[PDB]
From Swiss-Prot, chain A:
Subunit of the CAF-1 complex that contains RBBP4, CHAF1B and CHAF1A. CHAF1A binds directly to CHAF1B. Only minor amounts of RBBP4 are complexed with CHAF1A and CHAF1B in G1 phase. In G2 and S phase also monomeric CHAF1B is detected. Interacts with histones H3.1, H3.2 and H3.1t. GO terms for molecular function: chromatin binding; histone binding; unfolded protein binding. GO terms for biological process: DNA repair; DNA replication; DNA replication-dependent chromatin assembly; nucleosome assembly. WD repeats lie at residues 11-54, 64-96, 111-150, 153-192, 201-252, 272-313, 317-358. Its main location: nucleus. Keywords: Acetylation, Cell cycle, Chaperone, Chromatin regulator, Cytoplasm, DNA damage, DNA repair, DNA replication, Nucleus, Phosphoprotein, Repeat, WD repeat. The lineage of its organism: Eukaryota, Metazoa, Chordata, Craniata, Vertebrata. The keyword NADP does not apply. Belongs to the WD repeat HIR1 family. GO terms for cellular component: CAF-1 complex; chromatin; cytoplasm; nucleoplasm; nucleus; protein-containing complex. It comes from the Eukaryota. This is Chromatin assembly factor 1 subunit B. The chain holds residues 1 to 392 of 559 of the full protein. The gene is CHAF1B.
UniProtKB/Swiss-Prot annotation, chain B:
WD repeats lie at residues 22-115, 116-165, 166-213, 215-260, 261-304, 305-361, 362-394. The lineage of its organism: Eukaryota, Metazoa, Chordata, Craniata, Vertebrata. This is Histone-binding protein RBBP4. GO terms for molecular function: histone binding; histone deacetylase binding; RNA polymerase II cis-regulatory region sequence-specific DNA binding. Changing Y171A: Loss of interaction with ZNF827 and loss of localization to telomeres. The gene is RBBP4. Changing N118A: Loss of interaction with ZNF827 and loss of localization to telomeres. Expressed in neuroblastoma cells. GO terms for biological process: brain development; chromatin remodeling; DNA repair; DNA replication; DNA replication-dependent chromatin assembly; negative regulation of cell migration; negative regulation of cell population proliferation; negative regulation of DNA-templated transcription. There is a cross-link at K150 (Glycyl lysine isopeptide (Lys-Gly) (interchain with G-Cter in SUMO2)).
From Swiss-Prot, chain D:
Its main location: nucleus. Acetylation is generally linked to gene activation. Acetylation on Lys-9 (H3K9ac) impairs methylation at Arg-8 (H3R8me2s). Acetylation at Lys-98 (H3K122ac) by EP300/p300 plays a central role in chromatin structure: localizes at the surface of the histone octamer and stimulates transcription, possibly by promoting nucleosome instability. This is Histone H3.1. Keywords: Acetylation, ADP-ribosylation, Chromosome, Citrullination, Disease variant, DNA-binding, Hydroxylation, Lipoprotein, Methylation, Nucleosome core, Nucleus, Phosphoprotein, Ubl conjugation. The modification N6-succinyllysine is found at K32, K55, K98. It comes from Homo sapiens (Human). The gene is H3C1. The modification Phosphothreonine is found at T3, T6, T11, T56, T83. Disulfide bonds: none annotated. The modification Allysine is found at K4. GO terms for cellular component: extracellular exosome; extracellular region; membrane; nucleoplasm; nucleosome; nucleus; protein-containing complex. The modification N6,N6,N6-trimethyllysine is found at K4, K9, K12, K32, K55. The keyword Phosphoprotein applies. The modification 5-glutamyl serotonin is found at Q5.
From Swiss-Prot, chain E:
Homodimer. Part of the CAF-1 complex that contains RBBP4, CHAF1B and CHAF1A. CHAF1A binds directly to CHAF1B. Only minor amounts of RBBP4 are complexed with CHAF1A and CHAF1B in G1 phase. Interacts with PCNA; the interaction is direct. Interacts (via the PxVxL motif) with CBX5; the interaction is direct. Interacts with MBD1. Interacts with histones H3.1, H3.2 and H3.1t. Acts as a component of the histone chaperone complex chromatin assembly factor 1 (CAF-1), which assembles histone octamers onto DNA during replication and repair. CAF-1 performs the first step of the nucleosome assembly process, bringing newly synthesized histones H3 and H4 to replicating DNA; histones H2A/H2B can bind to this chromatin precursor subsequent to DNA replication to complete the histone octamer. It may play a role in heterochromatin maintenance in proliferating cells by bringing newly synthesized cbx proteins to heterochromatic DNA replication foci. Residues 142-178 are annotated as: Necessary for homodimerization and competence for chromatin assembly. Belongs to the CHAF1A family. This is Chromatin assembly factor 1 subunit A. The chain holds residues 477 to 713 of 956 of the full protein. It comes from Homo sapiens (Human). It is found in: Nucleus. Residues 99-139 are annotated as: Disordered.
Length: 365, 401, 79, 110, 213
């Protein structure tokens, strides 16, 4: 891969807290949407340059947040942006000075009492899941925009949410060193993954705002960062991987000695099963392989599914801690945010990670 | 007081004009006038900072107070910061801004010195040993690395090596760049002294004259060791003559190459840091003369733009063709040789000879001494007799074109 | 107790020294003390409310970084 | 010789970075300043009085107090830089209180 | 500390001998000025509109003016103001009336912080904190006493020791001052390929997956 640290003033050189990409457009020009302390959600055009360099072309400047913007999450269709600020306000920008396009806040959501940290969209795109400092992980409907559930069963801030693509689970992970999984219909904490057989996840003392975790788009792996394993001296910063067969106990984990892991974002496009070399542990045996990235505080670890060890590693690109990562719709990009003010882009060649499947397998919802 | 009035008016005009001509001017007012100035080769460029720190060696001419050899530290913005998108001006229309990003001159180390410091030249091999010339016959040798930053409150001075051998005071002193420790001094007693400091025992404090010279018939004004050779050094005196000396010769009063230099009394000389055959000698006839060591019979040229005496002629450590002359005219002409014998229009020739490249009119009083910055290009620290120390540099459009 | 004047005058002098200025009126030290007290008030109030919304008692550096982010500033090397 | 005379004893408002063409890679600001310039006792007593004014049993940690100190030194050097800019814009080098309020109101926190 | 080179030309062993030979011949055949125009003179190096069209920024600092030190690009072009004659007058380009006098008619008691004061002055003192614990281990002990969450005491002690060690390590790293972090990019290695470099393969196998039963 090619690492292109975009030495550009994203948000007044102020910290950038989350990134995302447009998954509804199949072109080679990708629409990113950053967010940071500048109380602005800047949307950019991202495309490969003449030499393959990932250059960023400004698209629009979005300004309706009174406080810092933490998490930005495009809808699965890509036509309904989200924006989780520090004012417990979730703007839903939908299209239609220096702006090349206009974005208008369609709807304002008022359900939280403190800063919103993580936002996730359901597979159908008609729902929502926001994790906020208020010790509540809310579930919102875009059509009506009201709090339908409040899982106020935590003890500290909730910093990471996700929606299971099959549509059955909603994994919320707090700063209480606990993992919670909520059914879509039951709306109960069925899986209180906190102990393994000592507590696994990091306490509230680690230097990272977010603990973002995401299900694999296939929907069978639950990848949760900020885990500690009592295998080294006293702690090993890892990233537990959970399987639907038994979510109480992870199938494995992906230790990241050095900086603790805080984000996981899987590449949405699947890949063909690479030929077996009889040298991998096969995290999950599936007809298709998929690539994700586990961004620690100051490093990125692009894993796979047929290979035990990561197939990549990107570190020291950003002086301060990383905040969020995002994969492009085609899978040729990996935009890594950072708290120092700039975002680096990891770019791949065409059909470089693998051979994407001609027909995307369906998921039993 | 009409002379002071016209001098101040010309200085005000020059200050108004200085954005056009100069590129870095740092006028500083010393506590006491300095009779010498010399940059030190060590330049500090701390990481994460946009300013580089140099060091000077300035004496102090005091009427009654104790004279301290000053080692000042200047601060100049880095070349990386020399072109930054800082701001813009609506009315001025230049991306400038005064602000507070500015240089600073701070005195670092002062050493008590008996009498005035006539000339303070640091040893190039060890840029910590410093030799100064006193109004007395002796020559002091200091070392600021072995002395406290704060001067001793008592008036007594403790030179590291007091060098004797003369009978008067002479502003001409020069270290030997190639031979470690050798020292030369041009006293007004019509005598030149060569001292071998590298042979001094660790417990020695006073060292006599290893070699004496008598060939000159008047007060020796200045001497300088050859920059490339080992046992060759010039000597210009009030006898309107220049004699090139050689220490390897047994005879000490034999002027190996004795040639009359100027109608008036020669005042200074400096050898080219690149060419091994070229030395430029000042004069009291306002005529800097170029010489070739191959043939001393006829001068290469007779640079004539001064109106008064010329005190210090220094070459350039960055260009082999760039001179600099100064004197009682308060005008530091920066000559060059690339324009030797160039045809010019009368309108552009009324200013002066084509060899002249820049005139520094920003000194209200006589220029005492000056020295080019060896690290930075064209930066010159010229100290005047009116307690002014300017660190100037002409703009890039006068030499690069 | 009432140690408003704890921040010494040369502390303000050095703060201005790397603050760019080299020319300060003499009656600005009271203004700087008041400014610092107000900033402490705001930052500590936000940090304490973050701690209270975390079911904890002792304020740590992460709460302070949260408070500074809420104000609009950023702290490097701590969170 | 040279005659020598007597020696005279002597002694615009929005700084919003444009979203593009800013290749800044500073590293000095991304690390600890290591220049506290405040003794621990006065700052400690100040934080203690603020905390006891706010809520009892609101204990702090040395890490938290050091974070306070670093943030406040950064805030005050930023304030003094802004007062410098305001005073220069006002054709006057000396700061005044009115310059402090002007910088505070320019930063948007007033 | 960067030292300017003592010699700006290559050391020629025969240079001294050639100079000694030429010093005695005293032949006027060689002319230096003639050869200057036929060759490049020897030089040595140092030891909104676009920037390239503006030039590099000028510093003009003066001691006698109350106005601060101008530090910025100057682009006005005036043919009358030539370097060979600085005191030329160019009206309608720069009005030759004083500007610094307008800048600062100060007449104020401004604490004179320019130099020699504000830095040398200092003080010292001592204090003890017992009732109020502003300490990392003392703070941890106080928060453990306030709330425990049924945690293990030896685990808490080990965590406190590890936190103290991490704080000490961070303080030590702060002593390194600026430290440029060179980006580390590792290619898309695969277990299928056999021609990959062993360095990358090992530095990635160090991040293997520890499977749990």
């Amino acid at each position: 891969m090619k690492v292109i640290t975009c030495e550009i003033a994203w948000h007044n050189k102020e910290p950038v807290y989350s990134l995302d990409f447009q998954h509804g457009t199949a072109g080679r020009i990708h629409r990113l949407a950053s967010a940071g302390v500048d109380t602005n959600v800047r949307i950019w055009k991202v495309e490969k340059g003449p030499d393959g360099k990932a250059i960023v072309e400004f698209l629009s400047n979005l300004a309706r947040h009174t406080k810092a913007v933490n998490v930005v999450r495009f809808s699965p269709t890509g036509e309904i942006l989200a924006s989780g600020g520090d004012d417990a306000v979730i703007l839903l920008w939908k299209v239609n000075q220096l702006n090349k396009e206009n974005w208008t806040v369609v709807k304002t959501l008022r359900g939280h009492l403190e800063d919103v940290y993580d936002i996730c969209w359901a597979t159908d795109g008609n729902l929502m899941a926001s994790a906020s400092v208020d010790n509540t992980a809310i579930i919102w409907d875009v059509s009506k925009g009201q709090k339908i559930s409040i899982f106020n069963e935590h003890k500290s801030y909730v910093q990471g949410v996700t929606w299971d693509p099959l549509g059955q689970y909603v994994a919320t992970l707090s700063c209480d060193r606990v993992l919670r999984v909520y059914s879509i219909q039951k709306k109960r904490v069925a899986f209180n993954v906190s102990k393994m057989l000592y507590r696994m996840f990091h306490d509230d003392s680690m230097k990272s705002f977010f603990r973002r975790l995401s299900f694999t788009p296939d929907g069978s792996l639950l990848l949760t960062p900020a885990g500690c394993v009592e295998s080294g001296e006293n702690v090993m910063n890892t990233t537990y991987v959970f399987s639907r067969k038994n979510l109480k106990r992870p199938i494995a984990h992906l230790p990241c000695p050095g900086k603790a892991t805080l984000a996981v974002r899987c590449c949405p496009v699947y890949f063909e099963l690479r030929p077996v070399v009889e040298t991998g542990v096969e995290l999950m045996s599936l007809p298709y392989r998929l690539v994700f990235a586990v961004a620690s505080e100051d490093s990125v670890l692009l894993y796979d599914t047929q290979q035990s060890f990561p197939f990549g590693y990107v570190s020291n690109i950003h002086y301060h801690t990383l905040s969020d990562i995002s994969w492009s719709s085609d899978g040729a990009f990996l935009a890594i945010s950072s708290t120092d003010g700039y975002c680096s882009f990891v770019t791949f060649e065409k059909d470089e990670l693998g051979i994407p499947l001609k027909e995307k397998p369906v998921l039993n919802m | 007081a009409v002379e002071e009035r016209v001098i101040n008016e010309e200085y005000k005009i020059w200050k108004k004009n200085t954005p056009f001509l100069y590129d870095l001017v740092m006028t500083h007012a010393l506590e006491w006038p300095s009779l010498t100035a010399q940059w030190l080769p060590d330049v500090t460029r701390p990481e994460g900072k946009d300013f580089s720190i140099h060091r000077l060696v300035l004496g102090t001419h005091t009427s009654d107070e104790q004279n301290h050899l000053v080692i000042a530290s200047v601060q100049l913005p880095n070349d990386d910061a020399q072109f930054d998108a800082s701001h813009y001006d609506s009315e001025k229309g230049e991306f400038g801004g005064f602000g507070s990003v500015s240089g600073k001159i701070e005195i670092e180390i002062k050493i008590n010195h008996e009498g005035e410091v006539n000339r303070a030249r640091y040893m190039p091999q060890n840029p910590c040993i410093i030799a100064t010339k006193t109004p007395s016959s002796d020559v002091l040798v200091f070392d600021y690395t072995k002395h406290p930053s704060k001067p001793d409150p008592s008036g007594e001075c403790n030179p590291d090596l007091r060098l004797r051998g003369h009978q008067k005071e002479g502003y001409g002193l020069s270290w030997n760049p190639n031979l470690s420790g050798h020292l030369l001094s041009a006293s007004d007693d019509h005598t030149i002294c060569l001292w071998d400091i590298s042979a001094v025992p660790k417990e020695g404090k006073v060292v006599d004259a290893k070699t004496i010279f008598t060939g000159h018939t008047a007060v020796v004004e200045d001497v300088s060791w050859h920059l490339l050779h080992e046992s060759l050094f010039g000597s210009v005196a009030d006898d309107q003559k220049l004699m090139i000396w050689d220490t390897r010769s047994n005879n000490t009063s034999k002027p190996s190459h004795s040639v009359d230099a100027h109608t008036a009394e020669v005042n200074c000389l400096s050898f080219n840091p690149y060419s091994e055959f070229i030395l430029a000698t000042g004069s009291a006839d306002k005529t800097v003369a170029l010489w070739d060591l191959r043939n001393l019979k006829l001068k290469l040229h007779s640079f004539e733009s001064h109106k008064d005496e010329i005190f210090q002629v220094q070459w350039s450590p960055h260009n082999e063709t760039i001179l600099a002359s100064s004197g009682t005219d308060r005008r530091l002409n920066v000559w060059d040789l690339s324009k030797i014998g160039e045809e010019q229009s009368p309108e552009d020739a009324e200013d002066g000879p084509p060899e002249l490249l820049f005139i520094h009119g920003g000194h209200t009083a006589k220029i005492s001494d000056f020295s080019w910055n060896p690290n930075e290009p064209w930066v010159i620290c010229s100290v005047s007799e009116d307690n002014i120390m300017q660190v100037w540099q002409m703009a890039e459009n006068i030499y690069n074109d | 107790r009432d140690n408003i004047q704890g921040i010494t005058k040369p502390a303000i002098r050095r703060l201005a020294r790397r603050g760019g200025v080299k020319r300060i009126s003499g009656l600005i030290y009271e203004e700087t003390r008041g400014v610092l007290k107000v900033f402490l008030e705001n930052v500590i109030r936000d940090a304490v409310t973050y701690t209270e919304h975390a079911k904890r008692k002792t304020v740590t550096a992460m709460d302070v970084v949260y408070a500074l982010k809420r104000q609009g500033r950023t702290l490097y090397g701590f969170g | 010789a040279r005659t020598k005379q007597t020696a005279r004893k002597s002694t615009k408002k929005p700084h919003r970075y444009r979203p593009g063409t800013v290749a800044l890679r500073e590293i000095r600001r991304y690390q600890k300043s290591t220049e506290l310039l405040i003794r621990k006792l006065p700052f400690q007593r100040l934080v203690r009085e603020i905390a006891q004014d706010f809520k009892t049993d609101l204990r702090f940690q040395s890490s938290a107090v050091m974070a306070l100190q670093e943030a406040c030194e950064a805030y005050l050097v930023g304030l003094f830089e802004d007062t410098n800019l305001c005073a220069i814009h006002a054709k006057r080098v000396t700061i005044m209180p009115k310059d402090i309020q002007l910088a505070r109101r320019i930063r948007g926190e007033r | 500390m960067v030292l300017a080179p003592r010699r700006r030309t290559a050391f020629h062993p025969d240079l001294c001998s050639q100079l000694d030979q030429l010093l005695q011949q005293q032949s006027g055949e060689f002319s230096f000025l003639k050869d200057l125009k036929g060759r490049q003179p020897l030089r040595s190096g140092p030891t909104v509109p676009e920037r390239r069209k503006f030039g590099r920024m000028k510093l003009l600092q003066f001691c006698e003016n109350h106005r601060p030190a101008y530090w910025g690009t100057w682009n006005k072009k005036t043919a009358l103001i030539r370097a060979r004659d600085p005191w030329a007058q160019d009206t309608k380009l720069l009005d030759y009336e004083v500007d610094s006098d307008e800048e600062w008619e100060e007449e104020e008691p401004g604490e004179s912080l320019s130099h020699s004061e504000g830095d040398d002055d200092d003080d010292m003192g001592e204090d003890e904190d017992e009732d109020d614990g502003f300490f990392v281990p003392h703070g941890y002990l106080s928060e453990d006493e306030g709330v425990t969450e049924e945690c293990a005491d030896p685990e808490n002690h080990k965590v406190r020791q590890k936190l103290k060690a991490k704080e000490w390590d961070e303080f030590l790293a702060k002593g390194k001052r600026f430290r440029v972090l060179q980006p580390v990019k590792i290619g898309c290695v695969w277990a299928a390929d056999r021609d990959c470099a062993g360095d990358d393969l090992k530095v990635l196998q160090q991040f293997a997956a520890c499977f749990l039963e």
